[PDB]
Design an enzyme around this catalytic site. Structure first.
Site, PDB file in Angstrom:
ATOM      1  N   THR A 159       0.774  -1.231   0.000  1.00 17.96           N
ATOM      2  CA  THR A 159       0.000   0.000   0.000  1.00 17.96           C
ATOM      3  C   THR A 159       0.806   1.283   0.000  1.00 17.96           C
ATOM      4  O   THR A 159       0.604   2.158  -0.855  1.00 17.96           O
ATOM      5  CB  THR A 159      -0.941   0.021   1.214  1.00 17.96           C
ATOM      6  N   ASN A 180       5.974  -1.512   3.575  1.00 18.02           N
ATOM      7  CA  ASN A 180       5.063  -1.108   4.643  1.00 18.02           C
ATOM      8  C   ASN A 180       5.812  -1.057   5.987  1.00 18.02           C
ATOM      9  O   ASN A 180       5.361  -0.377   6.920  1.00 18.02           O
ATOM     10  CB  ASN A 180       3.840  -2.021   4.718  1.00 18.02           C
ATOM     11  N   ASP A 261      -9.432  -3.983  -0.053  1.00 13.54           N
ATOM     12  CA  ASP A 261      -8.256  -4.655   0.510  1.00 13.54           C
ATOM     13  C   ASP A 261      -8.534  -5.309   1.886  1.00 13.54           C
ATOM     14  O   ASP A 261      -8.144  -6.467   2.148  1.00 13.54           O
ATOM     15  CB  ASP A 261      -7.121  -3.655   0.655  1.00 13.54           C
ATOM     16  N   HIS A 420      -0.880  -9.564  -0.575  1.00 11.69           N
ATOM     17  CA  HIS A 420      -0.312  -8.956  -1.793  1.00 11.69           C
ATOM     18  C   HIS A 420       1.084  -8.510  -1.399  1.00 11.69           C
ATOM     19  O   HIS A 420       1.407  -8.547  -0.212  1.00 11.69           O
ATOM     20  CB  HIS A 420      -1.155  -7.739  -2.210  1.00 11.69           C
ATOM     21  N   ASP A 680      26.381  -1.438 -14.380  1.00  7.81           N
ATOM     22  CA  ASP A 680      25.701  -0.775 -13.275  1.00  7.81           C
ATOM     23  C   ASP A 680      26.260  -1.305 -11.949  1.00  7.81           C
ATOM     24  O   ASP A 680      25.527  -1.855 -11.125  1.00  7.81           O
ATOM     25  CB  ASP A 680      24.173  -0.955 -13.370  1.00  7.81           C
TER      26      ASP A 680
HETATM   27  O1  LIG Z   1      -6.759   3.580   6.077  1.00  8.60           O
HETATM   28  C1  LIG Z   1      -5.522   3.327   5.979  1.00  8.60           C
HETATM   29  N1  LIG Z   1      -4.937   2.273   6.673  1.00  8.60           N
HETATM   30  C2  LIG Z   1      -5.736   1.476   7.609  1.00  8.60           C
HETATM   31  C3  LIG Z   1      -5.584   1.689   9.042  1.00  8.60           C
HETATM   32  C4  LIG Z   1      -6.433   0.974   9.962  1.00  8.60           C
HETATM   33  C5  LIG Z   1      -7.397   0.064   9.451  1.00  8.60           C
HETATM   34  C6  LIG Z   1      -7.531  -0.155   8.028  1.00  8.60           C
HETATM   35  C7  LIG Z   1      -6.705   0.548   7.107  1.00  8.60           C
HETATM   36  C8  LIG Z   1      -4.689   4.153   5.069  1.00  8.60           C
HETATM   37  C9  LIG Z   1      -3.692   3.665   4.189  1.00  8.60           C
HETATM   38  C10 LIG Z   1      -3.064   4.573   3.300  1.00  8.60           C
HETATM   39  C11 LIG Z   1      -3.430   5.963   3.302  1.00  8.60           C
HETATM   40  C12 LIG Z   1      -2.793   6.900   2.360  1.00  8.60           C
HETATM   41  C13 LIG Z   1      -3.421   7.960   1.647  1.00  8.60           C
HETATM   42  N2  LIG Z   1      -2.457   8.609   0.847  1.00  8.60           N
HETATM   43  C14 LIG Z   1      -2.646   9.754  -0.012  1.00  8.60           C
HETATM   44  C15 LIG Z   1      -2.945   9.328  -1.416  1.00  8.60           C
HETATM   45  C16 LIG Z   1      -1.892   9.115  -2.312  1.00  8.60           C
HETATM   46  C17 LIG Z   1      -2.158   8.793  -3.678  1.00  8.60           C
HETATM   47  C18 LIG Z   1      -3.504   8.652  -4.095  1.00  8.60           C
HETATM   48  C19 LIG Z   1      -4.588   8.857  -3.151  1.00  8.60           C
HETATM   49  C20 LIG Z   1      -4.299   9.203  -1.817  1.00  8.60           C
HETATM   50  C21 LIG Z   1      -1.229   7.974   1.026  1.00  8.60           C
HETATM   51  N3  LIG Z   1      -0.042   8.329   0.408  1.00  8.60           N
HETATM   52  C22 LIG Z   1       1.043   7.574   0.796  1.00  8.60           C
HETATM   53  C23 LIG Z   1       0.965   6.469   1.742  1.00  8.60           C
HETATM   54  C24 LIG Z   1      -0.271   6.139   2.316  1.00  8.60           C
HETATM   55  C25 LIG Z   1      -1.405   6.899   1.980  1.00  8.60           C
HETATM   56  C26 LIG Z   1      -4.435   6.381   4.236  1.00  8.60           C
HETATM   57  N4  LIG Z   1      -4.935   7.786   4.362  1.00  8.60           N
HETATM   58  O2  LIG Z   1      -6.062   8.077   3.976  1.00  8.60           O
HETATM   59  O3  LIG Z   1      -4.206   8.583   4.890  1.00  8.60           O
HETATM   60  C27 LIG Z   1      -5.045   5.506   5.100  1.00  8.60           C
HETATM   61 CA   LIG Z   2      -3.018  -1.349  -0.289  1.00  6.21          CA
HETATM   62 CA   LIG Z   3      25.148   3.017 -12.227  1.00  4.16          CA
HETATM   63 CL   LIG Z   4       7.175  -4.574   3.485  1.00  5.04          CL
HETATM   64 ZN   LIG Z   5      -3.487  -5.092   2.141  1.00  3.74          ZN
END
Ligand SMILES: O=C(Nc1ccccc1)c1ccc(-c2cn(Cc3ccccc3)c3ncccc23)c([N+](=O)[O-])c1
Ligand SMILES: [Ca+2]
Ligand SMILES: [Ca+2]
Ligand SMILES: [Cl-]
Ligand SMILES: [Zn+2]
Ligand SMILES: *[C@@H]1O[C@H](CO)[C@@H](O[C@@H]2O[C@H](CO)[C@@H](O[C@@H]3O[C@H](CO[C@H]4O[C@H](CO)[C@@H](O)[C@H](O[C@H]5O[C@H](CO)[C@@H](O)[C@H](O)[C@@H]5O[C@H]5O[C@H](CO)[C@@H](O)[C@H](O)[C@@H]5O)[C@@H]4O)[C@@H](O)[C@H](O[C@H]4O[C@H](CO)[C@@H](O)[C@H](O)[C@@H]4O[C@H]4O[C@H](CO)[C@@H](O)[C@H](O)[C@@H]4O)[C@@H]3O)[C@H](O)[C@H]2NC(C)=O)[C@H](O)[C@H]1NC(C)=O
Ligand code: NA
Ligand code: NA
EC number: 3.1.4.39
Length: 802
Positions: A159, A180, A261, A420, A680
């Site tokens: 993710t 992650n 997911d 995944h 490389d």
């Molecule tokens: O809900 C979650 N985890 C989770 C925690 C507890 C239970 C279930 C899931 C969860 C997981 C990820 C994110 C996330 C949003 N963006 C912004 C974003 C970037 C590109 C395109 C659309 C949006 C990010 N950019 C980088 C890394 C992570 C994120 C969020 N978030 O909204 O901040 C919440």
């Molecule tokens: Ca994901």
């Molecule tokens: Ca190189």
């Molecule tokens: Cl990882």
């Molecule tokens: Zn997942």
């Protein structure tokens, strides 16, 4: 400490987040335990739910309600998304015929069409077809807009790496979110999904879209949502921001869903429990589109519906345990699951040795479900090495499997049925892309592409200049109705020399030996002047994009750009028609290497070096097996066609050249082949300068390549031969690691016909990957548009089935 006794009154989901210890009302305050005391009450209203009903129509405004069905709600920008349907006899957006959006149709005061990114976690590509019955809003977006059959995530297909790749256009190795879970040895700090360290900005490199926008005067909605803010409220917040006055209204927004997911982990990608989460996501899309329509923004906004990765079937019983391979299991730390990363438990332990760990994990069980690599030996297409946060030892885990340290780790941590993270070529890891709006095309299907390309396009959609990134800007122009980016070819930096005959045989003392008419003497001369060049160089010569010294060498069967600095070709180009014949190397020519009288002894390789180097042998770039005549075969043995090869690698190379090129020429109706060396040594995916070469043929200045590439081009219409093609091209490429053993292939003691092609498939590559690695620029002279050639250069032949 937060003095959480300030107030969110008139501040709900404020766009600029305020500085501690003043309390926060932004969409991330919850995640930081820092919301003002009255945030739930004021900002997270829920009374009466999310939908208008007949009896609420024209109600007296009650500020307690989650959303409103009062008369003033349109002007306030806070109606329930179904207000107009229930109370004004309007239709739902999904029930309206789609009609081409030729131009943006936006309210006065909108300077540009807004962009809304709707990202869904774990939305596997095949959901689009397989779940189509229960996703009517998503299916309308897809069929009316622009869509790909799938979008390729980055590796690892987790993710945080993928969402941040979406936001930046960068490989995880360059943005820094390499999994992650992470340990950074310079910080001596760890990054985890749960907890606080992840909020520290020093983890997050590159420049994400919201920063790119802000810096260039485009306002952005905050992209992150605390998990406890429900979906309906995220959507309503976005629709409210869209009602702000012109000077305060963002132009870019993101919605994030943790579904499907979250359910996929529990029930598997196609568990019967999966239908409901897909229904509910579709309902959310429905709410947004109905809300946009109410605001008259449904023919004005560009919407991107995009996944971060797919989901595969994975159970606890399909776990390999390192404790079944390693005696010293307690001396290592493993990052576990769908990929492995291994480091020493203690840096004060100098008896820890990666070489013996790798060896103990190599081909030990007949059906082993992971393969160990030093990170620099991973397939270059993964771009997964140039970061201190990526451990030297990596395990590529088979799809459907897990790796763990000890059995106790699994049952003292079956819960899950999906996971995944696997190789980003795996079909089950593919995810989705749909673009809908004035700036996207109408009812258009585009080929699959990689998610690293989207940041450029999002910048184009917003009139922004992208920060430097790994997309190839212009390769996705075919997605867009307008706002295309019009790229120009890079300028050639070094022009070639074209040497004639300048040296006598006896000036060479290379320790090489070879056992070697007016009609056919004018004949050989014309060939050396470039007479057959239009046959073997079909797309122009590659441009050299750095400063160097090199010569073009023409021959009957092939043409090469020969580096006086590296003492071998940078590239060798040749065409093999469907009718061509394979021959063998005659006995009297088995060890033949011939001086090249166009090239000085001082800029040549020598045979003595290879004799002396007990480890290193040599191969040829243009294969002698494919010579057009006994006499042309002598050209293939020129010292300028020779490259250093480990005997173990020669098995690979010889099979590719003797068997596979001919096979591809048969199957594809002729092929053009460009092959060459890659250096490389610092595994950054970029061409090494001379002072970076860590290994040479013993006692010489002949540098040892880390990899060998080939780019194999033919006509997309395979009824036309490669050399007479009137339309689009078709390409496959690879970057084979130049290794002194075949440990990577567990079947290597068998006939090359049982393992070599499998290895090449694993090391499939984009032309663009080879460009970065060589400083060359291919396809300079074709009849095709440049945007089309850019799309071709980003193509990856993946060898998965349908
Ligand atoms: O809900 C979650 N985890 C989770 C925690 C507890 C239970 C279930 C899931 C969860 C997981 C990820 C994110 C996330 C949003 N963006 C912004 C974003 C970037 C590109 C395109 C659309 C949006 C990010 N950019 C980088 C890394 C992570 C994120 C969020 N978030 O909204 O901040 C919440
Ligand atoms: Ca994901
Ligand atoms: Ca190189
Ligand atoms: Cl990882
Ligand atoms: Zn997942
Ligand atoms: C994918 O796209 C990306 C983006 O375009 C490509 O990456 C770029 O490649 C460039 C060439 O490698 C690189 O340019 C170097 O930048 C140095 C300055 O770097 C800082 O500033 C930038 C710009 O704001 C910033 O983005 C950087 O951020 C990195 O580092 C921080 C923290 O360390 C991280 O938060 C962040 O995630 C990012 O890390 C990644 O990149 C670095 C390399 O910069 C890696 O080490 C990490 O592993 C990680 O992957 C920085 O904050 C600059 O100092 C360099 O200049 C040296 O080399 C030049 C050559 O021209 C030489 O002339 C100079 O003298 C100088 O040498 C001196 O330093 C040497 C090293 O200490 C030393 O050996 C010498 O003796 C000298 O003292 C150089 O110009 C650029 O930074 C990155 N950008 C990004 C975002 O990664 C990438 O190549 C593409 N991939 C492919 C396959 O195409
Ligand atoms: Na040798
Ligand atoms: Na082997």
């Amino acid at each position: 400490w937060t003095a959480t006794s300030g107030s969110c009154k008139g501040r709900c989901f404020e766009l600029q987040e305020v500085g501690p210890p003043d309390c926060r009302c932004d969409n991330l305050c919850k995640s930081y335990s820092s919301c003002c005391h009255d945030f739930d009450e004021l900002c997270l209203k829920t009374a009466r739910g999310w939908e208008c009903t007949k009896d609420r129509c024209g109600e007296v405004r009650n500020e307690e309600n989650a959303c409103h069905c009062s008369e003033d709600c349109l002007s306030r920008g806070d109606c329930c998304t179904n207000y107009q349907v229930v109370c004004k006899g309007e239709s739902h957006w999904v029930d309206d015929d789609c009609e081409e959006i030729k131009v943006p149709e936006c309210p006065a005061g909108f300077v540009r069409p807004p962009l809304i990114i709707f990202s869904v976690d774990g939305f596997r590509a095949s959901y689009m077809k397989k779940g189509s019955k229960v996703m009517p809003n998503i299916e309308k977006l897809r069929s009316c807009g622009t869509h790909a059959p799938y979008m390729r995530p980055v590796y690892p297909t987790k993710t945080f790496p993928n969402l941040y790749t979406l936001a930046t256009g960068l490989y995880p190795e360059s943005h820094g979110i390499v999994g992650n879970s992470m340990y950074d040895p310079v910080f001596d700090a760890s990054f985890h999904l749960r907890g606080r360290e992840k909020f520290n900005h020093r983890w997050w490199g590159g420049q994400p879209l919201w920063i790119t926008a802000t810096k260039q005067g485009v306002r952005a909605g905050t992209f992150f949502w605390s998990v406890s803010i429900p979906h309906e409220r995220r959507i309503l917040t976005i629709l409210q921001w869209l009602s702000l006055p012109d000077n305060e209204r963002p132009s870019v927004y993101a919605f994030y869903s943790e579904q499907p997911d979250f359910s996929g982990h529990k029930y598997g990608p196609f568990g019967p429990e999966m239908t409901n989460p897909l229904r509910e996501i579709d309902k959310t899309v429905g709410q947004l589109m109905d809300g946009l329509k109410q605001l008259r923004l449904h023919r004005c906004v560009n919407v991107i519906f995009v996944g971060d990765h797919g989901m595969e079937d994975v159970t606890c019983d399909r776990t390999e345990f390192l404790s079944n391979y390693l005696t010293n299991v307690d001396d290592i730390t493993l990052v576990p699951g769908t990929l492995g990363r291994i480091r020493a438990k203690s840096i004060n332990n100098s008896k820890y040795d990666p070489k013996t760990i790798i060896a103990a994990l190599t081909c030990k069980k007949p059906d082993q479900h992971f393969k160990p690599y030093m990170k620099q030996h991973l397939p270059k297409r993964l771009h997964y090495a140039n970061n201190r946060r990526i451990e030297d030892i990596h395990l590529l885990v088979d799809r459907r499997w897990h790796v763990a340290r000890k059995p106790l780790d699994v049952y003292k941590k079956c819960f899950f049925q999906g996971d995944h993270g696997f190789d980003n070529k795996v079909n089950s890891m593919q995810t989705v892309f749909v673009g809908y709006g004035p700036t996207f095309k109408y009812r258009t299907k585009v080929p699959p592409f990689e998610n690293i390309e989207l940041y450029n396009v999002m910048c184009d959609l917003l009139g922004l200049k992208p920060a430097p990134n790994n997309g190839t800007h212009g390769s996705l122009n075919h997605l867009l109705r307008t706002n295309t980016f019009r790229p120009t070819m890079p300028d050639e930096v070094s022009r070639p020399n074209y040497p004639g005959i300048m040296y006598l045989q006896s000036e060479f003392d290379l320790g090489c030996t070879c056992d070697d008419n007016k009609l056919e003497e004018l004949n050989k001369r014309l060939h050396t002047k470039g007479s057959t060049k239009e046959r073997h160089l079909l797309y122009g010569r590659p441009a050299v994009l750095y400063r160097t010294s090199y010569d073009i060498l023409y021959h009957t069967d092939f043409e090469s750009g020969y580096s006086e600095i590296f003492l071998m070709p940078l590239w060798t180009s040749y065409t093999i028609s469907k009718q061509a014949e394979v021959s063998s190397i005659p006995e009297h020519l088995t060890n033949c290497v011939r001086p090249d009288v166009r090239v000085s002894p001082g800029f040549s390789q020598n045979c003595l070096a290879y004799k002396n180097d007990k480890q290193m042998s040599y191969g040829f770039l243009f294969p002698p097996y494919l010579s057009s005549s006994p006499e042309a075969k002598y050209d293939a043995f020129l010292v300028t066609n020779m490259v250093p090869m480990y005997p173990a690698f020669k098995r690979v190379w010889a099979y590719f050249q003797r068997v596979l090129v001919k096979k591809y020429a048969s199957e594809r109706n002729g092929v053009n082949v460009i092959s060459g060396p890659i250096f490389d040594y610092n595994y950054d995916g970029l061409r090494d300068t001379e002072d970076e070469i860590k290994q040479y043929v013993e006692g010489s200045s002949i540098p040892v390549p880390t990899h060998y590439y080939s780019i194999i081009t033919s006509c997309l219409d395979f009824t036309q031969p490669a050399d007479k093609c009137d339309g689009p091209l078709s390409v496959s490429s690879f970057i084979l690691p130049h290794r002194p053993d075949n440990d990577e292939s567990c079947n290597s003691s068998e006939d090359e016909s049982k393992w070599v092609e499998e290895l090449m498939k694993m090391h499939t590559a984009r032309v663009r990957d080879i460009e970065h690695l060589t400083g060359l620029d291919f396809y300079r002279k074709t009849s095709r548009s440049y945007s089309e050639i850019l799309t071709l250069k980003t193509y990856l032949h993946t060898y998965e089935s349908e």
